[PDB]
Design a protein around this ligand. Structure first.
Ligand SMILES: CN(C(=O)CCCn1c(N)nc2cc(Cl)ccc21)C1CCCCC1
Length: 377
């Protein structure tokens, strides 16, 4: 799948985008890859932050659905006009499909000033499509209309700019080492999974596992951070604050409220612990674990334009909507979204940034009992 390798570009913290064309003749746009939403939505008006926008007047294959969509969220919103048009991915399979497109005509704190992307490609399921599950997501359209197998895979490579690979319709063996390990997709809405055990430095947090998945755990390329439920994040940092005693830091640091800095290069990775998430396996009583480094959860902030050292945001933080395995997780791994078999695969990435003493890993099998129980109803 060589034509697809390295088809993702981005800047640190601003997400990963892929080049897409919409309409006839084709209009090129950069489109954020988002496994945490299900709408294909593109800027359609000259917002000042946008390099470019979808011009429906130029497209002979444009069809109006004559229906609006309104998408509110915490700090903002986007809204627009539903329609369909012809859509392709130049560095993706060699096919063109008719997909639903939300033409965004108003938004608040949605677009990033300084970023080079102009829309979002929600790769998750119809269940969370807006305004409702009858709006067929792009990837469902793609599979329905071509012979492209029902799966895609992501290698997010992380670095000011980032690259990676979205392989649509298959798996590229050169993007990973060792074996793939699969965790079941518990339900087709978000890419929901079940974490069954957590260890910081080989030490079990010994929380009821149900806590880990309260009330969801999801895989999300649209989120930078590893995000954790309040009750689990308290426990996580308690053990993280404790594994890292040689040095102390502001309390706000841990709340993602202040930054932390050391003399350039002088960052002590090693006083920071590895974190291991055991996921539900394919077999009864069987699990596997993925292990990430501090080099994954301490992410270097380029933008302190009032600083001269090495400052990082603690990239773990809390939620009311459950665990989110964002780019901090995904960047250590090759992630396989095997929709045809309702499972997600993880292997060690051939690109993840490794150091002398400690390495990201995917290991199994382990014996874990009562893994169902870990899920929330
Ligand atoms: C505000 N945002 C987020 O909080 C991202 C985290 C959750 N999330 C994801 N993955 N896709 C999203 C789409 C919307 Cl409309 C709102 C939240 C989203 C998104 C704004 C649009 C681009 C991705 C970040």
């Amino acid at each position: 799948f060589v034509e697809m390798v390295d088809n993702l570009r981005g800047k640190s913290g601003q997400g990963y985008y892929v080049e897409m064309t919409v309409g006839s003749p084709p209009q090129t746009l950069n489109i954020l890859v988002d496994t945490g939403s299900s709408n294909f939505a593109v800027g359609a008006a000259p917002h000042p932050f946008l390099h470019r926008y979808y011009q429906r007047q130029l497209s002979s294959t444009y069809r109006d659905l004559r229906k609006g969509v309104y998408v509110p969220y915490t700090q903002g919103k986007w809204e627009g006009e539903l329609g369909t048009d012809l859509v392709s991915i130049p560095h993706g399979p060699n096919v063109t499909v008719r997909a639903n497109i939300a033409a965004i005509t108003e938004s608040d704190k949605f677009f990033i000033n300084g970023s080079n992307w102009e829309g979002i490609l929600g790769l998750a399921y119809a269940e969370i499509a807006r305004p409702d599950d009858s709006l067929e997501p792009f990837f469902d359209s793609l599979v329905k209309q071509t012979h492209v197998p029902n799966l895609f895979s992501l290698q997010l490579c992380g670095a000011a700019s980032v690259g990676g690979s979205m392989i649509i319709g298959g798996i590229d063996h050169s993007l990973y080492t060792g074996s793939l390990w699969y965790t079941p997709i518990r339900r087709e809405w978000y890419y929901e999974v079940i974490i069954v055990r957590v260890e910081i430095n080989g030490q079990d947090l010994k929380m009821d596992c149900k806590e880990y998945n309260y009330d969801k755990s999801i895989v999300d390329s649209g989120t930078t951070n590893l995000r954790l439920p309040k009750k689990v994040f308290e426990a996580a940092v308690k053990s993280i604050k404790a594994a890292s005693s040689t040095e102390k830091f502001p309390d706000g640091f841990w709340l993602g409220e202040q930054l932390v800095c050391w003399q350039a290069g002088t960052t002590p990775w090693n006083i920071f612990p590895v974190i291991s998430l055991y996921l539900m396996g394919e077999v009864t009583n069987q699990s596997f674990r993925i292990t990430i480094l501090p080099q994954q959860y301490l992410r270097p902030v380029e933008d302190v334009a009032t600083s001269q050292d090495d400052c990082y945001k603690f990239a773990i933080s809390q939620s009311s909507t459950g665990t989110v395995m964002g780019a901090v997780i995904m960047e250590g791994f090759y992630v396989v979204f095997d929709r045809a078999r309702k499972r997600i695969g993880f292997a060690v990435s051939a690109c993840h940034v490794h150091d002398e003493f400690r390495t990201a890993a995917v290991e199994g099998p382990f014996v874990t009992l009562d893994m169902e129980d870990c899920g929330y109803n």
